[PDB]
Each structure stands twice: as structure tokens, then as C-alpha cells.
Amino acid sequence: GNYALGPEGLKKALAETGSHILVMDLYAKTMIKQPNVNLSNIDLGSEGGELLKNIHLNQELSRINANYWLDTAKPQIQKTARNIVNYDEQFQNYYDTLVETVQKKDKAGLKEGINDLITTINTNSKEVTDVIKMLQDFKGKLYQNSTDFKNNVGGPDGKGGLTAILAGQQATIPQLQAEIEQLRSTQKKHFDDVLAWSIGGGLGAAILVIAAIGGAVVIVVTGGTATPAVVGGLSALGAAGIGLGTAAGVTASKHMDSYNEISNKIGELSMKADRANQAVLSLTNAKETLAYLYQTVDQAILSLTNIQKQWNTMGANYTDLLDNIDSMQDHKFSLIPDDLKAAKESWNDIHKDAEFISKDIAFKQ
């Protein structure tokens, strides 16, 4: 067209943002359900007793950070999506007036309408900057809690901390720690592969997958270790028209089943372990999740930075129209409705999916 008045790359950025919200919700809920590590009636010496006291303080702060995600940080990301919905409602409500001002050759009227939309675009861009600052602050708190916990569990380098005291008592502990770390990194890759398939299908498909997974998540606590699983995997998507039965859908289903397979295995390791080995499992599990949490907020910051870039690009595109209207000859002026109509359709197309991202994913209560 002559003027690009549509949502630009907002669809792709929303799909990524929705995927990060799901992952943060899972990790936060898992952290909240994991209890303080039980090493009662195990002689750890004074060194180990101090490390255990510090670990319990770290675990209490992990649960505070998880609740901050759920109650404070997430709603600010959801407002970013609500602002997309509200821009569509403003655009749809201005549309007939903007078309009328073209038909009446009313340049002042059209310019005032476009200026009002620019005002909203600029407000939306400024609001994302504030959300990114809030997330950067939160990332700093997640990184501090992660590194404090890692140091109390394993020292700076994995050669120390409470795990080395327990490994001094039981020679099988290092192999157990390594097994958990491997299972958790394999499992995260499987979940990332499911998310890759859901994003690859477009925002519409992404929202159906997010709803199906969120609605099916259960958190199981075994031997003091909390582990998520997705009941029935991707089963609920079989009639969703997103290609679950395609080769790529079958691969995504297999990854979800492998994710659940690893949750089962971690529970099995915990069931068979004594108290000390259960502590190695639970602390190692938590260590991995606390690092994944700050990594996922970093990803969320990147996706909101992209949303900010899209609002800024859109503000430039509308300002180009605004600046050109006064000198524009009648023929080009009469074509502006092509750009309005194209934008009407693209904005309406993003509304329901933005609305979804603006509201909690429905997990079990």
C-alpha cells in the first residue's frame, strides 16, 4: 500500500510472549509447591548446618519471587497485550470517521484522527519501556537468588556447598546430581521443541497449544521434589485444526510425551532415595529451575523489546501519513481508504489472540 497502518510484527512477538508466560507460570508454580529441603537428623556438622539454614532462606525467597511473577510482573506483561486489544478497539471505532473524512475531502478531520491514533501508539511504546524496566529489576532479583542458591548447594564451581558434604557421606551422590542435571536439560529441550512447533503454526495455533497445556498441568511433589507434568500430553488438540496429526504434530506430541516421561523418571528417583539422596534431588532440581527462571525473563525482555520496536515503527508509518496529508493531491488522498481497510482487517485479526494473552492462562485452582 502507500501507508502501512497495520500491527506490523505484533503477531509474532505476541506468540513468543505467550510462550514465555506459560513457561514462567510453570516454573513459578513448581517453585511454590517445592517445600524447604528436609535434612533433619542428618549430621552435617556446623558448616553443613549453616549451609542448610541459608538454603532454607534461599528457598523462602524463591517462593516470594515466584509469587512476584504471578501477582505483579505477569499482570504488567498482560497489560502490554491489553494495550494491543485497546488499540484495535480504538482503530475499529475511528475507522468510519477516517473513511468519512476522506470522502468529504476533510484533511483537518483525517489528520486529527491519525494524530489521536499516534498519541495511543506513543503511549503504548512508552508503557512497554516501563514493563521492561520492571522485568530487568526482577531479573536482577532472580539472578541473585539463583547464584546464592547455587553457591549454597554446590559452591561457585560445583565442588563445594551442601552437596559436597552429602557426597562426602555417600559416594553415589555426584552421579545422582549429574543424572538430574541431564534429565532437566533434556526435558527443557523437549518442552522448547513443543513451543517451537506451536509458535511455528502462528499466533492462533500458539494460543490453542498454550491453553491445552496450561489446562492439563499438574505439579507432583515426591521426596520433597516438585515436578510438572501435562495430563494427556497434547491429546486435546486432535480436532483443533493445527496439524497435530501431521509429521510435525506427531513430533511435537512425542516431545510432550518425552517431557512427561522425564517427570515420571524424576519422581521414580525420589521414591527410591533415602533422605540425603532426596535432598540432592530436590536441591539440584531447584537449582536448575532458578537458572531457567532468570533465562526465561531475559527471553521475555527480548520479546517485549520487539513489541516496543513494532510500536515505534508503526508510529513512524502513521506520522508519515500525517505529515503527507496537507500537500497530498486529490487522487492519492482518495486512495488512503485502501490502507485504512487493510489495517482494519489486520487489527481485527489480532484482537482475540491479544485478548487471550492479556488474561491468565487457565491452570487448575
Q: Which structural domain, as residue segments, surrounds residue 304?
A: 9-358
Report the length, in residues, of the chain. 365
> How many Cβ atoms sit within 10 Å of the Cβ of residue 82?
16
* Number of domain units in the chain: 1
C-alpha dist (Å) from residue 258 to 126, 187, 221, 255, 267 = 42, 7, 19, 5, 14
| Strand pairing category for 225-230 and 217-222 | antiparallel
| Cα–Cα dist 289/24, whole Å | 10
Q: Residue 75 is placed in which grid cell?
A: 499482570
In a domain, 311, yes or no: yes
Q: Is the dihedral of CA 169, 171, 173, 174 positive or negative?
A: positive
C-alpha dist (Å) from residue 197 to 16, 192, 250, 272 = 12, 9, 10, 35
| Cα–Cα dist 96/87, whole Å | 15
Quick check: 358 and 85 in contact, CB under 8 A? Answer: yes
| Cα–Cα dist 210/215, whole Å | 8
| Cβ within 8 Å of residue 125, ≥6 positions away | 308, 311, 312, 315
Q: Is the dihedral of CA 47, 52, 53, 55 positive or negative?
A: positive
Give the E-state strand segments of 145-298 in sequence order. Answer: 217-222, 225-230
The one-letter amino acid at 310: Q
Q: Is 229 helix (H, G, I), strand (E, B) or coil?
A: strand
In a domain, 365, yes or no: no
CATH number of residue 319's parent domain: 1.20.1170.10
**Using a CB cutoff of 8 Å and minimum separation of 24, what contacts does 163-167 make?**
163/280, 163/283, 163/284, 165/44, 165/45, 165/47, 165/48, 165/51, 166/44, 166/276, 166/279, 166/280
In a domain, 201, yes or no: yes
CA-closest candidate to residue 24, choices 364, 358, 297: 297
> How many Cβ atoms sit within 10 Å of the Cβ of residue 306?
17
| Cα–Cα dist 201/74, whole Å | 24
Quick check: 21 and 77 in contact, CB under 8 A? Answer: yes
Residue appearing with cell numbers 494460543: 207
Residue appearing with cell numbers 521434589: 225
**Using a CB cutoff of 8 Å and minimum separation of 24, what contacts does 185-191 make?**
185/288, 186/258, 186/262, 187/258, 187/259, 187/262, 187/263, 188/292, 190/255, 190/256, 190/258, 190/259, 190/262, 191/23, 191/255, 191/256, 191/259
DSSP conformation letters of 14-59? HHHHHHHHHHHHHHHHHHHHSPPP--TT---HHHHHHHHHHHHHHH
| Cα–Cα dist 332/313, whole Å | 22
Helix axes 173-200, 161-169, angle to 10 degrees: 130
In a domain, 96, yes or no: yes
Which uninterrupted H or E stretch holds 291?
Answer: helix 275-325
| Cα–Cα dist 6/317, whole Å | 9
Quick check: 16 and 310 in contact, CB under 8 A? Answer: no
| Cα–Cα dist 58/149, whole Å | 6
Q: Is 323 exposed, middle or buried (0-12, 13-18, 19+ CB in 10 A)?
A: exposed
Which uninterrupted H or E stretch holds 325?
Answer: helix 275-325
Residue appearing with cell numbers 488499540: 87
In a domain, 1, yes or no: no
In a domain, 241, yes or no: yes
Q: Is 227 helix (H, G, I), strand (E, B) or coil?
A: strand
Quick check: 285 and 30 in contact, CB under 8 A? Answer: no
Q: Is 222 helix (H, G, I), strand (E, B) or coil?
A: strand
Which uninterrupted H or E stretch holds 205?
Answer: helix 203-216
Residue 155 region, left (φ>0) first, then alpha (ψ -120 to 50), else beta?
left
In a domain, 364, yes or no: no
In a domain, 285, yes or no: yes
Question: Among the residues of 44-156, which ranges form H helices?
Answer: 45-68, 74-103, 107-154
